[PDB]
């Protein structure tokens, strides 16, 4: 399969994620399933992660 | 393409390597064809990896 | 002897085809002296 003709613009399906509670899990709600979580925060040293 | 170039450089074009990495002879082999074609553990281990 | 007879009968017939005597893995000993080792020069000239 060529990347350009077959996968490049195709919107992907929904990944396996859990319905995080907004109130109970408010500490991780906005960043839990990011690729490298907290990468642009003061919680890590920098992009080298 | 690397394994395909190796197969074709050794003049073993009567072996088809398909896109799921199965090496099959395209025709009935003579004894000399079989003897020249027997590949090794490096080729076959790389092909299965 | 058969091939030589056919060759001399075709050469006198006008047709001339040379055949590849150069088998792989083997040397042509007629192109040049094989593994030349010329005699060392002594106190006597040998040019003539």
């Amino acid at each position: 399969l060529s990347w350009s003709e077959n996968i490049e613009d195709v919107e992907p399906l929904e990944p396996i994620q859990m319905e995080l509670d907004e109130d109970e899990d408010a500490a991780v709600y906005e960043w839990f399933y990011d690729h490298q979580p907290l990468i642009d925060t003061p919680h890590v040293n920098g992009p080298s992660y | 393409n690397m394994l395909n170039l190796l197969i074709h450089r050794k003049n073993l074009t009567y072996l088809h390597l398909d896109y799921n990495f199965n090496l099959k002879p395209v025709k009935t082999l003579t004894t000399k064809e079989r003897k020249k074609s027997r590949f090794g553990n490096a080729f076959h281990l790389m092909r299965e990896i | 002897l058969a091939a030589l007879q056919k060759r001399r009968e075709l050469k006198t017939a006008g047709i001339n085809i040379k055949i590849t005597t150069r088998k792989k893995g083997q040397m042509d000993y007629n192109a040049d002296i094989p593994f030349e080792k010329k005699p060392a020069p002594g106190f006597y000239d040998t040019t003539e």
Binding site: - | H8, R9, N11, T13 | -
Partner: protein
């Protein structure tokens, strides 16, 4: 005039050759499978003929001295013309190249092939090309003469009509190679595919003697250019003035001496001579 493109780009590309086999070997780029004897007898006609009168012209390499010629112009297949990086014109007698390379900018081997074709060899100065596969007619000499005066400057045109094979000896390496690669599988008046190879040396004692004499006159020309003209005249021994000059100069007094050639004809930083 500017160089004219010969073929539109729509015709020429990088296409796979005819399917003369069952599977395409992509390393060697050859149609494997099937018979091997049929390929050996499968010559084909060329895809175009160059003509210098209507197609040669100015290009980028013409303004650049010390360039190389265009091989794809000689076959009449160069599809860009003025914007080609190599020369588009017949070589002269002054277009002299080094022995390492031919006139087309290709490396030049140490020996020929089995079929005596290709680039050439720097182990033998060859200005003579074999032109075989000529349909036998009565006016082979005329058509060979015109179609090879098209491609440069000839010195000998041996033709053997009884079986119809020609030997053409040009005057230059560049013109010989240009005529060889320009007429490769090119058509004659009759619809045939010519066999223009390099030519094996003739066993005719005369031809051998004159090719030898060409070798020694070329060496003599280079030596006479390298040596001082005073040395050439003083050694040459045809002018009586040169002889008596030789006596008086290689006397240094001591009548009847006649100094050795290793001292009299010696070039060095200090030396004992007029030098130069």
């Amino acid at each position: 005039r500017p160089a004219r493109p010969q073929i539109d780009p729509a015709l020429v590309k990088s296409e796979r050759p005819p399917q003369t086999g069952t599977v395409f070997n992509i390393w060697y780029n050859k149609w494997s499978g099937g018979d091997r004897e049929d390929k050996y007898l499968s010559q084909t006609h060329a895809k175009g003929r160059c003509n210098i009168a209507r197609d040669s012209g100015y290009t980028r390499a013409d303004s650049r001295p010390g360039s190389y010629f265009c091989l794809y112009f000689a076959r009449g297949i160069c599809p860009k013309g003025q914007d080609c990086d190599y020369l588009h014109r017949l070589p002269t007698i002054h277009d002299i190249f080094n022995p390492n390379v031919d006139c087309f900018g290709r490396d030049k081997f140490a020996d020929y092939r089995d079929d005596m074709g290709g680039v050439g060899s720097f182990n033998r100065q060859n200005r003579t090309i074999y032109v075989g596969r000529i349909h036998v007619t009565d006016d082979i000499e005329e058509i060979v003469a015109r179609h090879f005066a098209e491609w440069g400057q000839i010195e000998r045109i041996r033709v053997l009509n009884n079986r119809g094979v020609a030997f053409i000896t040009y005057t230059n390496e560049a013109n010989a190679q240009f005529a060889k690669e320009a007429m490769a599988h090119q058509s004659l008046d009759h619809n045939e595919i010519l066999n223009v190879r390099w030519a094996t040396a003739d066993p005719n004692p005369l031809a051998q003697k004159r090719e030898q004499r060409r070798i020694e006159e070329q060496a003599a020309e280079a030596i006479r250019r390298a040596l001082p003209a005073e040395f050439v005249a003083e050694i040459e021994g045809k002018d009586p003035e040169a002889r008596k000059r030789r006596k008086l100069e290689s006397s240094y007094g001591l009548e009847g001496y006649e100094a050795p050639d290793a001292v009299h004809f010696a070039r060095g930083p200090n030396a004992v001579n007029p030098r130069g």
